[PDB]
Symmetry: C4
């Protein structure tokens, strides 16, 4: 947010780590399109409704969250700050926001989960199905509340910034959960049968995939082109959200991510029908600023912007915000 | 207008007062969108009609106005010139244009109204309903002809220019009517029952709110996103105007504001169905130029541009201009 | 064309005469929109048709023309070259292109018509109906073949370039036909009854005005916003052309002008249904280059570009070009 | 690709040869539009499908190709490298990609075909029908597998770069097949009756021409505006592809070219329904880099980008990629 935040991160981080963070695949057409898609959306606000008890809280996966928002899974957070995932998870817990532990976290998932709060666990499918399901079991044993199964990474997209930078994981950053293979619908079934936790498919863009996700027993989906980091030229999730929300017809939670940069963007996502958004890169920008406090400031400012936007739009509740109409600009 | 006017104001005013005037909320997406929306509108002019008696006059709220236009409520006009509201109101009266006295005027509403002309009074709802209705009574006792109830400010939008400027009301600028709380439909009813003056709801953007405004007994609405100063990402009024005009079906006056910068823009608004426009920032630019004469020059030039545009479009009357067709460009 | 032409005119002409030529009214929104509208049009070419006898000729108002094009009426052509209208008319005659003599020509209409060729006469309605009809009679007596009645100038649009330039007709440039008032449909009838020449209404933009023009006995219309020089914000003629062509259903010739800068633009206009185009400013650019030869070079190059474009589009005739389909871009 | 490639060619080639290569006709509106049209296309990827045997191979004209792609006919390839067509054809053969020998090749078609691989032959119709059909016979005798009949060049478009450059074929570059006239549908029939090879009409943009091509016995069409080099203002092939694919209803192969710059662009073309693309200018950029190796590197990188894009989109086969949905952006 407040560009300075991104800029502040521009300066403190090595250019090639900032590139790892900011970049997309190919020509970054889908990265830029996420922003263009949000900027095209205008909200039609409602006036003169009772705002005496404006609340940004939602119930999701059986638990309350302070905002319609969770921290997106972003790998190797020690790349951005020495406290890495622990800093972010602490601030998320204190802000009442779920935090998604990555399969490729630079601190073990048991440690991040001990922080408390509302930890979710993002799963990459491993070449060994038994390693995959043991990771799922670890996450559940550790008290994670949802498995965020990433389904748009059969393999990683081609990041031209990382290729031009000759960038590689510095020696001091490890994959702490370890001491990969394309997921299919069969993999989704294996996870679903292995856990009672809600399974959330992250990276759904096609309407029929959203429908199939509900048929497959998913508790939610994240409508997402992976921040423009996977298929270059993939439609933005925000452009598919309304259609997907209609097709799912309440059958699972529908989250969206990609380019959420303000409370007004959260409002736009919710007016398009999203249950909640994920926020990725901005949380990592703040992480270069004071973990339990730099991230906490981001979340407080986002929390205030959401509350402001909702009230100006006449929405006492997130549910009311989902019933707002929108109009697409140019 | 004539940019020089804005520029002329650029130089004479402190940078932080010009920012108070020119800015919007958030990223100023709705501020810029008001202009983009007008620029997209093209008029289909009619030819060869009798123009022998081209008149820009309208009847609104029982009285004639010289142009389909009123001065928008803009608070603390002494911020822009030492004569402040008195300068503007005098020029408006002389131009035959209604002038909207602000709740937050830097000269008392009784004084501005003594200037004569066609004063309207803009109301902010106060935390105390009895203070609100006493303000309404004052305005009516003072001869104001309409209550412009601002309904899109449950609280003020977040103005990043003002936050970055650390801007605050200079010591010499006071709220002369005094020596706030979210309005609801119940507040609208309280005002309507308290006065025989037409009540005009300013800040309506949703079609169903426009319909409800007529149901609630409003004499008019102003289709408006508050000059991009309230919800950032709120649709421009100009983009909702045609739909709202159709839904109201003549049930109240439908004004529009936001980015009106010329007589051609007035024509566009009227061709989209508006009864009249409000003009805000341009009147304040002129106010740095000679009150009873700088504002008067703006209004004369606007008056001439409206007359020119109407005749070139084949419209002998504002009513004829409302029957013009339009085509949206890119 | 070949920008150099415009640039070449940029240098030779006084800045304030080039401004008189190049400018539009208001913010020049309609001036720029004429170009944006043509650039949005894409032609769907046809392949493999017989091109053995590609011809750019058309019949219009009973006579053959070499190209689907005439020189637009542009006043005071001695502003641009000492031979003024005589230079242009000679080159037009030699190119087989009709030439529109202006009411405000800087050489008498009898003299221009003596040049020969296919002279049309553009009429401004004069405050005195008898002066108007005597001008029509002069034109007819002089052998003009069509009266181009300009119907979009009840008065002249506000040209901000001319106002900022304080520009005025130099002393050596006269209105040679003399030694004005809004036209109405009654004026059109007066002209139609006064002459057997086809009457062509120039400046029609509304579909119902095009229909009424046919009802009124017009032999043609020019779909035109006057080169963006009259109502600022008037739709481009090119954007109304297809609709107008359909509504007229062959009932009169439908010309278009505004921003025609190449043979490809001529093809686009004809594919949208135009009978012919008018070309204005480019002819005057060339006029700063050698009358009977600078204009003649423009017309030869335009003639070649039209022939090229038509053949590449698979059109042996202008009629075939009118049956081409188009697709609008962004 | 990797701009450097184009830039690398920017430096090594004479400015006027690079212009011959890069330029289009007229204002290059159709050249630029080919790129804008691809950039507007977004793919809706599918998730969680079996990718165990992702293959980019297709069958076309009875033979397998490694990728849904062939080298476009580009004349006088010795303009770009001393080995010219032989370098490109060798790399194409090694990459399993068809190579289109030009009528105006700077090495004889018998020699290029001796290289082996999958040579196609592009035909310009000659003023002498017997010369045309003897060229067709030569190509067939030499083992070419398809006649690519160019149908959008009754004559060459007007290339303003070449006219401004006064550019002409250097003395050392010859038309090796020799030691022209507009084609019609009758010419197409003459070719079809003269050969058992599939006849592929290159330069089809109109739906009815695509239909007629199938009626005429074509084995394929290339939906193409000739890289923006023929009619300036011709619609991009990519913008007509979906409509043409639907109208042909499997009746012939439908190729597309124009602005294909990546594997993602190949995916977009195939998702719009194309059987295969042609790639022109990029192959010639690489040709300034090492024939049997510079072109080979381009084709390997394109091959990898296609495979990547297909898998990220959930497509195990090119056929699956054709069933992807797309969404048009702005
Ligand atoms: C920037 C970044 C993103 C990801 C990662 C790393 C980096 C450095 N790693 O790959 C994750 C992972 O490990 N698992 C996964 O599912 N998604 C990942 N993502 C992307 C994901 O969470 C997005 O949905 C998010 O970026 C939304 O957009 P934003 O708010 O605009 O940033
Ligand atoms: C610029 C400015 C505007 C307002 C204010 C102050 C400033 C410095 N204060 O907040 C008022 C108020 O006190 N009450 C209210 O109803 N509206 C207000 N407005 C806005 C309002 O009148 C708009 O509708 C107008 O700006 C149209 O757009 P414009 O012509 O483009 O300028
Ligand atoms: C530039 C210019 C134009 C005119 C004039 C003067 C100047 C200096 N005088 O006013 C005429 C007149 O005397 N009568 C009339 O009917 N139209 C006139 N026009 C405009 C008219 O002919 C247009 O339709 C044309 O400009 C098309 O556009 P273009 O090809 O882009 O230039
Ligand atoms: C650049 C260039 C192109 C052609 C030529 C020369 C040059 C220097 N000569 O004229 C050919 C020919 O001899 N025969 C023919 O059918 N097409 C030709 N083309 C064009 C053709 O193959 C296009 O379809 C292609 O450019 C796709 O676009 P791209 O990938 O963006 O480049
Ligand atoms: O491709 C991406 O942006 C990613 O998701 C990360 O690199 C990752 O997950 O490893
Ligand atoms: O937010 C705004 O632009 C305003 O309306 C003024 O600041 C106000 O009314 O006080
Ligand atoms: O307004 C215009 O551009 C004109 O038509 C000329 O100035 C004119 O006709 O006098
Ligand atoms: O016009 C073009 O780009 C071409 O096709 C080549 O110049 C050619 O074929 O000779």
């Amino acid at each position: 947010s407040l560009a300075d935040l991104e800029r502040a991160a521009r300066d403190v981080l090595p250019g090639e780590i900032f590139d790892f963070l900011a970049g997309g695949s190919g020509t970054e057409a889908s990265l830029v399109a996420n922003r263009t898609a949000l900027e095209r959306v205008f909200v039609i606000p409602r006036m003169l409704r009772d705002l005496t008890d404006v609340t940004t809280e939602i119930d999701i996966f059986g638990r309350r969250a302070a905002l319609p928002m969770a921290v997106a899974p972003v790998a190797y957070q020690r790349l951005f700050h020495p406290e890495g995932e622990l800093a972010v998870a602490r601030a998320a817990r204190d802000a009442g926001v779920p935090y998604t532990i990555c399969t490729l976290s630079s601190v073990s998932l048991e440690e991040i989960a001990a922080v408390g709060g509302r930890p979710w666990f993002q799963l990459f499918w491993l070449r060994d199905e038994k390693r995959s399901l043991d990771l799922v079991r670890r996450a559940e044993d550790a008290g994670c509340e949802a498995i965020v199964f990433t389904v748009d990474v059969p393999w990683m997209g081609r990041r031209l910034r990382d290729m031009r930078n000759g960038f590689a994981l510095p020696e001091w950053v490890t994959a702490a959960n370890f001491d990969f293979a394309p997921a299919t619908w069969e993999s989704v079934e294996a996870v679903r049968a292995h856990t009672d936790l809600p399974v959330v498919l992250k990276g759904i863009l096609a309407v029929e995939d959203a429908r199939r996700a509900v048929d497959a027993g998913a508790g939610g989906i994240v409508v997402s082109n992976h921040g423009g980091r996977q298929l270059d030229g993939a439609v933005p999730g925000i452009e598919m959200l309304g259609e997907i929300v209609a097709a799912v017809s309440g059958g699972c939670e529908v989250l969206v991510d990609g380019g959420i940069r303000s409370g007004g963007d959260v409002l736009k996502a919710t007016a398009l029908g999203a249950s909640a958004v994920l926020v990725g890169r901005p949380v990592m920008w703040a992480l270069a600023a004071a973990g339990q406090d730099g991230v906490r400031q981001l979340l407080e400012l986002l929390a205030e912007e959401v509350r402001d936007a909702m009230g100006l739009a006449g929405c006492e509740s997130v549910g009311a915000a989902r019933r707002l109409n929108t109009k697409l600009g140019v």
